[PDB]
Amino acid sequence: PTASPTASPTASPTASPTASPTASPTASPTASPTASPTASPTASPTASPTASPTASPTASPTASPTASPTAS
């Protein structure tokens, strides 16, 4: 007699693979701000002018008098 045969063996199994990871995203940037503007300045005002003055006037002159006449 002999011995009963046997089926061949098999290598063990393996878990499936996985895709690699990725770093998370980021919100986009923004330009910096600016201070508000200002209306331009102005030169300072001035009081108005005045016409020149005048010396006071004078009453007119008179001729001198004369003594009265006489008979001869």
Tokens of 61: 């002159």
Separation CA 32–CA 38 (nearest Å): 20
**Dihedral Cα 38, 39, 40, 44, nearest 10 deg:** -120
DSSP string computed for 39-60: ----------------------
**Interatomic CA distance for residues 5 and 37, integer angstroms:** 99
This structure's resolution (Å) is 3.5
Structure tokens at 6: 């046997």
- Residue 55 burial by CB count (10 A; 0-12/13-18/19+): exposed, middle or buried? exposed
Backbone angles phi, psi at 37, to 5 degrees: -90, 180
Three-class DSSP labels, 26-38: CCCCCCCCCCCCC
